[PDB]
Amino acid sequence: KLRYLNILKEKLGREPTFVELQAFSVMWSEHCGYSHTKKYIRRLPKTGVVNLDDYYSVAFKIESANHPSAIEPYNGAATGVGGIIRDVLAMGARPTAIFDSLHMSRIIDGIIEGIADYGNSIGVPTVGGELRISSLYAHNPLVNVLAAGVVRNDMLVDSKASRPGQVIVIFGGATGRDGIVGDPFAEKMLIEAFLEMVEEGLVEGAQDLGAGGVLSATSELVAKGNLGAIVHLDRVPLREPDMEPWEILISESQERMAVVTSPQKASRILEIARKHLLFGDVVAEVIEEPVYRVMYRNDLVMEVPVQLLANAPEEDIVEYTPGKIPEFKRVEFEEVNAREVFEQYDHMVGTDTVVPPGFGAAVMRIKRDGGYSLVTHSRADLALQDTYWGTLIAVLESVRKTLSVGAEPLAITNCVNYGDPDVDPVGLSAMMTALKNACEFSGVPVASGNASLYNTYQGKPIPPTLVVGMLGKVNPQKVAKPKPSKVFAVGWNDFELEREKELWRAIRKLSEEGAFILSSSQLLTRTHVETFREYGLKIEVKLPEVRPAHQMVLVFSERTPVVDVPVKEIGTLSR
Ligand SMILES: Nc1ncnc2c1ncn2[C@@H]1O[C@H](COP(=O)(O)OP(=O)(O)CP(=O)(O)O)[C@@H](O)[C@H]1O
Ligand SMILES: [Mg+2]
Numbered sequence: 162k163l164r165y166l167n168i169l170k171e172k173l174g175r176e177p178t179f180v181e182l183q184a185f186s187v188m189w190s191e192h193c194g195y196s197h198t199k200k201y202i203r204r205l206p207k208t209g210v211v212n213l214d215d216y217y218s219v220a221f222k223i224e225s226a227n228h229p230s231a232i233e234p235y236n237g238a239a240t241g242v243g244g245i246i247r248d249v250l251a252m253g254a255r256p257t258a259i260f261d262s263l264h265m266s267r268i269i270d271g272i273i274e275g276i277a278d279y280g281n282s283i284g285v286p287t288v289g290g291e292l293r294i295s296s297l298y299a300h301n302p303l304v305n306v307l308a309a310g311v312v313r314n315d316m317l318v319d320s321k322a323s324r325p326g327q328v329i330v331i332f333g334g335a336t337g338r339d340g341i342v343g344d345p346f347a348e349k350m351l352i353e354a355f356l357e358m359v360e361e362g363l364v365e366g367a368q369d370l371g372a373g374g375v376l377s378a379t380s381e382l383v384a385k386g387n388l389g390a391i392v393h394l395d396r397v398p399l400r401e402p403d404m405e406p407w408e409i410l411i412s413e414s415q416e417r418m419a420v421v422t423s424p425q426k427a428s429r430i431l432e433i434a435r436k437h438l439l440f441g442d443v444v445a446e447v448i449e450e451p452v453y454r455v456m457y458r459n460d461l462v463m464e465v466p467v468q469l470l471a472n473a474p475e476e477d478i479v480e481y482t483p484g485k486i487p488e489f490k491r492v493e494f495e496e497v498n499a500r501e502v503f504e505q506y507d508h509m510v511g512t513d514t515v516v517p518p519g520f521g522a523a524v525m526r527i528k529r530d531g532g533y534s535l536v537t538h539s540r541a542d543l544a545l546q547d548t549y550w551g552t553l554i555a556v557l558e559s560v561r562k563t564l565s566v567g568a569e570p571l572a573i574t575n576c577v578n579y580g581d582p583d584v585d586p587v588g589l590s591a592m593m594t595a596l597k598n599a600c601e602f603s604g605v606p607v608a609s610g611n612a613s614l615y616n617t618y619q620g621k622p623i624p625p626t627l628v629v630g631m632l633g634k635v636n637p638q639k640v641a642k643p644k645p646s647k648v649f650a651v652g653w654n655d656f657e658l659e660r661e662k663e664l665w666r667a668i669r670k671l672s673e674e675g676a677f678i679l680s681s682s683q684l685l686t687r688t689h690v691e692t693f694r695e696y697g698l699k700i701e702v703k704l705p706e707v708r709p710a711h712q713m714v715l716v717f718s719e720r721t722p723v724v725d726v727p728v729k730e731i732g733t734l735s736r
């Protein structure tokens with residue numbers, strides 16, 4: 162913030178006001194700023210609402226609740242959920258499935274329950290997830306939450322102001338002195354509320370309220386529209402009435418959404434909200450002038466170029482060149498049979514999928530012959546040994562899982578979980594390049610993502626962990642389910658980037674022929690066995706010895722697979 166303060170000062174041509182420093186403290190903070198990752202992200206291929214069938218689109222995104230969680234496992238995680246759901250809800254999509262990618266040194270119930278309760282409380286199933294246990298995350302639990310929803314392409318909500326005159330409504334829970342705990346009940350009302358507003362063609366644009374609260378929502382909603390905004394802090398319904406404009410402006414009270422609309426629609430927006438027991442008012446006004454004038458009645462609180470707020474100081478970036486794929490070695494993440502713990506908290510117990518998520522990619526259908534896959538994958542264990550390849554391979558194995566389910570990879574929502582970038586700007590680059598190159602190799606673009614840097618315990622950084630939330634397309638009727646069959650190991654014990662595509666081609670043919678397929682580092686895990694039992698199936702196999710980063714999958718079929726990849730009957734699935 163030292164360099165920044167200067168910069169902010171040079172840009173202000175003067176000395177920052179309390180509110181100014183207060184505001185830019187948020188907007189430029191790495192969390193809302195992305196100073197170390199912005200340029201790395203602009204480099205990634207893109208497209209977070211991915212179309213699905215020219216009629217439906219799935220809005221999905223991943224988010225981390227790291228620091229919060231490290232403090233308040235329960236609240237942190239839950240808050241991350243709440244927030245990520247709004248990000249999706251704001252896209253005008255009805256949140257249909259939560260996914261989490263937990264990375265901890267142990268089974269921290271707080272996080273599991275926090276995630277679980279919230280989702281249940283708002284009625285959004287916690288379909289799938291991922292759980293990685295490593296002492297290496299002792300003081301830095303990586304709580305990544307991904308959410309997905311469905312949205313008719315003709316109901317897609319623009320995520321920004323796009324016309325002077327439009328006004329921004331802030332509704333949902335009230336604003337109080339928070340971050341300057343939220344309930345799913347208000348969140349659920351928020352979803353029902355916002356969704357109703359969408360259904361009525363009232364929401365012309367929107368943005369959820371999280372980091373930066375009212376400041377980030379408004380400044381961004383318009384900044385994204387290359388417009389301005391006159392924000393009236395006094396119009397924000399508060400919980401604590403004595404709050405100061407700056408408190409009202411940067412407050413991060415939860416369960417709050419900003420709705421861009423036409424003055425004429427604001428009324429219903431408020432009616433719809435209120436009848437849903439939420440509070441809201443027309444807080445801002447989208448103006449053509451690119452200024453961000455925060456007001457509290459006729460009191461000018463703050464006025465700055467919206468764009469200055471929007472664009473934080475961008476750190477340079479170093480080009481990273483990757484070397485020979487390492488001969489990865491044992492970096493054990495003691496797998497926990499924490500299936501009893503999830504049961505106790507009703508977590509990831511989402512039985513409403515085309516096929517149990519415990520088999521890899523969670524499949525959801527939006528129609529009889531239509532549906533989408535979703536997977537959250539990461540290879541921290543590998544990324545620890547080599548940031549690039551590990552990170553890259555994590556993307557490739559996600560493509561496998563997606564393929565293994567018969568789903569064609571559509572997009573990637575991803576979360577960068579890194580330590581201090583100023584110290585190790587390399588790992589950050591390696592991580593981003595791997596992803597960049599990974600998307601380029603796979604051809605799968607990046608729809609959106611989250612970045613969490615400075616994850617370190619007294620010097621030590623958390624393992625470079627890029628969680629990959631991969632969206633895939635799939636016809637449910639064409640999704641293979643477990644059945645007594647022969648189990649074959651298909652692929653290789655080791656990894657050679659290039660031949661990855663021949664493995665995919667293979668997964669594709671087999672999957673196409675209806676074969677069942679698992680793509681796991683362990684080939685088969687307790688969950689896989691667990692889940693098979695749910696089908697009343699016994700998995701007896703001579704699991705091939707495999708490398709950490711390998712290119713082998715488990716194919717279950719009657720007939721022996723016939724592909725251009727090593728095939729070996731390794732056992733059977735029966736009874
Ligand atoms: N690794 C990544 N890849 C692609 N896009 C990324 C990214 N990291 C961040 N982004 C994008 O940059 C912006 C910020 O992501 P972030 O998750 O912090 O958003 P947010 O506005 O929802 C704030 P909050 O945490 O308060 O909910 C988004 O528009 C997101 O799509
Ligand atoms: Mg932000």
Ligand SMILES: [Mg+2]
Nearest residue numbers: 248369370371
């Ligand atoms: Mg947000």
